[PDB]
């Protein structure tokens, strides 16, 4: 369950493939909650690769459904990242996560 709301500018064709180290300007948000993690804060925009399950499933599936320049908006379901477990101190159990995802990638 990945719902994509793309802010219009981009190219619409440069999709992430397998093993491509790609760069995302993410900005996390909790439903009826504040921020918890942001690549804008560290200004190190999280050079991660596709296909190793490094990122969560709500963020991995939102990456391949975007293209270069595009600015989508994730609505991550709880049961893909932390719905039953929950992270201690950051993400509670059964949380619907929100991400300001822009795909300005490499490779």
The active-site residue out of 15, 26, 48, 59 is 26
Verify whether residue 98 is a known catalytic residue.
no
Verify whether residue 48 is a known catalytic residue.
no
Task: Categorise residue 4: left if φ over 0, alpha if ψ from -120 to 50, beta otherwise.
Answer: beta
The active-site residue out of 48, 91, 99, 100 is 99
The full length of the chain comes to 107
The active-site residue out of 79, 82, 91, 100 is 82
Of 41, 12, 21, 46, whose CA–CA distance to 29 is shortest? 41
Verify whether residue 50 is a known catalytic residue.
no
Verify whether residue 56 is a known catalytic residue.
yes
Catalytic residues: 26, 36-37, 56, 82, 99
């Amino acid at each position: 369950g990945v719902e994509i709301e793309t802010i219009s500018p981009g190219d619409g064709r440069t999709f992430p493939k397998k093993g491509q180290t790609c760069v995302v300007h993410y900005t996390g948000m909790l439903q009826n909650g504040k921020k918890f993690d942001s690549s804008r804060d560290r200004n190190k925009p999280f050079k991660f690769r596709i296909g190793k399950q490094e990122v969560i499933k709500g963020f991995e599936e939102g990456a391949a459904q975007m293209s270069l320049g595009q600015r989508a908006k994730l609505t991550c379901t709880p049961d893909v990242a932390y719905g039953a477990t929950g992270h201690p101190g950051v993400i509670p159990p059964n949380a619907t996560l929100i991400f300001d995802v822009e795909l300005l990638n490499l490779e």
